[PDB]
């Protein structure tokens, strides 16, 4: 369900106030830690020597209550970027004081405003507090979708509101945040508390917050419409944005007095729970990929490493994938052996990289359904998986299945195959080295033989995500290049991100490969039209495969195979983020390189600006042959 908090700027008695917000159904409270009006002096006598206490006692709540129920708030008079020096200095000292009291109390989060363009000194003081003692505490930057100056009633006779379209000007508050978090060096402890107004901006402005670390959404009571019964409700547009924010699992903060006075503060909250419960439920893919949202994983290298038992088990937990393989073999047997030969022509089928046997059983189900005869060779290099295969062949399959414990590139086969079947594909199609493996095996395929899969193509799309860029950045390990995290791909359930252009094909492979001079190396130039103002953090990779004819598998979002969850997308990061303006083209270059020993990718952005070539010579990342 919804995790929600009450924002208040008036707490006369902390215990009663907390109890009231708890009664109303709120999970936490956003409140001042010093009195909002209590302006303090640190330099000038006599105000400097003001007798204490400077605030309320910590004794007023249990440690558990301070740690879990209270989000502190910076005093509104603290203005570190004021044009009055005396104010700047007192606000610096007041800012540290309040931030330090919050740290002292063990508060889980602390709100600071971004209500003007220049927050340089606010950022310097925050950055300096983060580098004074190592703490886990979060800083929530209260930022509005629409700056108050662009929201003001057009009631000033001699200062009219601009009635002209200002594409970049309407995105100004995103820049307030961008600059603030750039100055603070992408601290993981600095997130957004996005404040939503009565009138929503143009969609492009809402889309600017895509891929940003949004921890909370601030809903003022004043934005709620009144329904016929008098209950607080929202516009279809506001409702649309709430559903985006529910997918991001943000915490909802209710600010403002009750304007639906005939009801209680729990009625604002009740509506959100209603919207939450009434949203579409999670499908097969949405339930599978639950704890994997934006979780970076190393891509598997099944050729170099023998995969564990529980890895083949989740591989096998994909009915759509294997239904498709069955249908592809079924279609091929029928095309290869006509009805009058259905008892004289036994098709020699080879499962190349058979694992625990799901393609061996799929080949058997295909032959029974096609009413055709088959001979099977189950080739597996992983001796541990071969233990499953040999116990399956003895207990069930029988002499029909010949288990081969060999590398497919080294196996001297007794006879040629009619069909070679394999599932050597990774999230980027060829990243697990399916081309090389099948190339060294196709010598034992008949001159008129079929490969299932017969073809595969990778796709790339530019993405924006300050969340994932910061995730990659945090992957620094000792005793290696301090920047190697950015020169390697990740398999990730890409969740908080923005796709900047439609995917475009990258590398394609065909099996069998009839080239007289077979070359698996590649070089591809992609030009991506970008129609938004954004920041490029990397490239999302996907793939499509033709198993047999019209029988396909796909992880490209536009053509995604329904209900299939084997592969999550790949992510190729870039060391430095790149500013991209509306109408600009993102140009990327990708290479597939190899040795006798290893295979790797190198990539570089050459427009709107250049990047360094990533992973040169496979220095940071290689795939073992």
């Amino acid at each position: 369900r919804v995790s929600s908090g009450r924002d208040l700027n008036c707490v006369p008695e902390i215990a009663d106030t907390l109890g009231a917000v708890a009664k109303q159904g709120f999970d936490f409270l956003c409140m001042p830690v010093f009195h909002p009006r209590f302006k303090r002096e640190f330099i000038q006598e006599p105000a400097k020597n003001r007798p204490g206490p400077q605030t309320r006692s910590d004794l007023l709540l249990s440690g558990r209550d301070w740690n879990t129920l209270i989000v502190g708030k910076l005093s509104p008079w603290i203005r570190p970027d004021s044009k009055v020096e005396k104010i700047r200095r007192n606000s610096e000292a007041a800012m540290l004081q309040e931030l330090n009291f919050g740290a002292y109390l063990g508060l889980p989060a602390f709100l600071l405003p971004l209500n003007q363009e220049d927050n340089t000194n606010l950022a310097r003081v925050l950055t300096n507090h983060i580098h004074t003692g190592h703490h886990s505490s979060m800083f929530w930057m209260r930022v509005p979708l629409v700056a108050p100056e662009d929201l003001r009633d057009d009631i000033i006779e001699n200062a009219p509101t601009t009635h002209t379209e200002e594409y970049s000007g309407e995105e100004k508050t995103w820049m307030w945040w961008h600059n603030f978090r750039t100055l603070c060096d992408y601290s993981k402890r600095i997130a957004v508390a996005l404040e939503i107004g009565a009138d929503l901006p143009s969609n492009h402005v809402i889309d600017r917050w895509l891929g940003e670390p949004i921890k909370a959404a601030i809903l003022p009571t004043s934005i709620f419409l009144t329904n016929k019964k008098g209950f607080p409700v929202l516009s279809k547009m506001h409702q649309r944005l709430i559903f985006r924010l529910l997918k991001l699992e943000v915490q909802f903060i209710i600010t403002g007095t009750n304007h639906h006075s005939e009801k209680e503060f729990c009625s604002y909250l009740q509506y959100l729970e209603y919207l939450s419960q009434n949203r579409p439920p999670p499908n097969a893919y949405e339930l599978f990929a639950k704890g994997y949202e934006d979780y970076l994983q190393s891509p598997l290298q099944p050729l170099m490493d023998n995969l564990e038992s529980q890895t083949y088990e989740v591989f096998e937990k994909d009915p759509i994938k294997y239904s498709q393989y069955q249908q592809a073999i079924y279609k091929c047997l029928l095309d290869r052996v006509p009805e009058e030969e259905k008892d004289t022509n036994v098709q020699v089928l080879m499962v190349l990289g058979a694992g625990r046997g799901p393609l061996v059983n799929a080949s058997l189900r295909a032959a029974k359904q096609a009413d055709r005869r088959i001979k099977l060779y189950a080739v597996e290099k992983n001796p541990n998986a071969v233990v499953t295969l040999e116990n399956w062949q003895f207990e069930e399959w029988g002499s029909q299945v010949t288990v081969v414990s060999s590398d497919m590139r080294e196996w001297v086969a007794p006879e040629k195959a009619d069909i070679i079947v394999s599932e050597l594909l990774g999230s980027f199609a060829d990243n697990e080295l399916s081309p090389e493996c099948l190339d060294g095996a196709q010598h034992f395929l008949k001159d008129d033989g079929v490969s299932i899969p017969g073809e595969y193509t990778s796709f790339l799309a530019p993405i924006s995500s300050s969340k994932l860029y910061n995730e990659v950045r945090a992957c620094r390990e000792k005793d290696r290049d301090p920047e190697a995290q950015f020169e390697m791909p990740y398999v990730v359930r890409l969740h908080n991100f923005h796709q900047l252009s439609a995917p475009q094909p990258c590398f394609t492979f065909s099996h069998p490969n009839r080239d007289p001079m077979i070359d698996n190396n590649r070089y591809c130039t992609l030009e991506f039209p970008v129609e938004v103002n954004t920041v490029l953090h990397g490239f999302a990779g996907y793939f499509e495969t033709v198993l047999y004819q019209d029988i396909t598998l796909s992880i490209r979002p536009e053509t995604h195979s329904p209900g299939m969850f084997s592969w999550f997308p790949i992510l190729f990061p870039i060391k430095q983020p790149i500013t991209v303006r509306e109408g600009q083209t993102i140009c990327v270059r990708f290479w597939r390189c190899s040795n006798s020993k290893k295979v790797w990718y190198e990539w570089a952005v050459t427009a709107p600006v250049c990047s360094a070539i990533h992973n040169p010579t496979g220095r940071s990342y290689t795939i073992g042959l």
């Binding site: 009195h35 000038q44 003001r50 204490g52 309320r56 009055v84 108050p148 009631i155 000033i156 001699n158």
Partner: protein, 310 residues
């Protein structure tokens, strides 16, 4: 101490207002310690203030008091931290201070209140950036204005016009308001946008001139009809909290600051008097309606000072 009156007065003195008869009104806030609330006090003997036991009336409010104003001779209009605009009425005997209305229309602390010339309407400014026009009789908001782009620091009703009021904000605007116009506010000020305006005072005799204090101790003389600034002086070393005119035919201007001093200035903004009596921020100033050379100040040091202005 009278009945209903709190046993102790809150340390942070927010307002000092002399009634036409001479009875001093006091606004108080608890800005530190366990409980963050306020209180309203009446002192028929101004020399007995701030002493709790020697008061005519006293009451406790739910939250602190950011601003106060006498509504007539018995009413008290309160700007609360709660987001409420509160109207309290003095007793028939004037021995109790009873709540008439408590309306939560502002989304943040109510920082400034002003009674309009007729005494039937009032204007409030808030940290929520709005300015609301109140019908004191119907206990309702007639008009809500979001003209500003940052918190409303001050609102001052014109002396003798029920349609006109001034407002200032952290958005660097000083707005002249005429509810008679379809677009009621109009941006006024000096040739250059300097330091943020923090206090306003309409002139009691010239209804087309006002004074404004800024966040850097400057006091400025402004003709609305000439819309260009004539006189200005660096009176204080810190933000000008308040500006209050003496009842005199030729008025004296009392200036307040966070520098913890009081200054009394002539017509040409020249310094006449200066008091460093306070050891904390000076919050209000009221000239006695009785002795015209007697000026009362309240601060956060809990001192009710009575100055003799030469």
């Amino acid at each position: 101490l009278p009945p209903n009156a709190p046993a102790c007065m809150e340390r942070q003195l927010e307002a000092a207002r002399y009634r036409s008869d001479g009875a001093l009104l006091l606004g108080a806030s608890s800005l530190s310690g366990r409980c963050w609330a306020g209180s309203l006090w009446l002192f028929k003997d101004p020399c007995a203030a701030p002493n709790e036991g020697f008061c005519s009336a006293g009451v406790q409010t739910e939250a602190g008091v950011a601003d106060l104003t006498w509504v007539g001779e018995r009413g008290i209009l309160v700007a609360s931290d709660s987001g409420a605009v509160e109207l309290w009425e003095l007793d028939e005997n004037e021995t109790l201070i009873v709540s008439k209305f408590c309306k939560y229309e502002h989304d943040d602390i109510v920082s400034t209140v002003s009674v309009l010339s007729s005494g039937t309407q009032a204007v409030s400014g808030s940290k929520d950036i709005c300015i609301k026009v109140w019908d004191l009789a119907q206990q309702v908001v007639l008009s809500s204005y979001r003209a500003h782009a940052a918190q409303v620091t001050c609102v001052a009703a014109s002396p003798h016009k029920d349609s006109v009021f001034l407002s200032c904000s952290e958005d660097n605007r000083i707005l002249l308001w005429d509810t008679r116009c379809p677009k009621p506010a109009s941006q006024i000020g000096c040739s250059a946008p300097g330091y943020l305006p923090t206090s306003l005072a309409w002139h009691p005799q010239q209804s087309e001139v006002f004074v404004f204090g800024d966040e850097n101790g400057t006091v400025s003389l402004v003709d609305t009809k000439s819309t260009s600034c004539v006189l200005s002086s660096a009176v204080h070393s810190q933000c000008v909290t308040g500006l209050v005119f003496s009842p005199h035919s030729v008025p004296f201007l009392a200036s307040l600051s966070e520098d913890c001093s009081l200054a009394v200035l002539d017509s040409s903004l020249s310094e006449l008097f200066r008091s460093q009596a306070h050891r904390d921020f000076v919050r209000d100033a009221t000239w006695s309606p009785l002795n015209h050379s007697l000026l009362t100040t309240v601060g956060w040091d809990h001192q009710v000072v009575h100055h003799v202005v030469p």
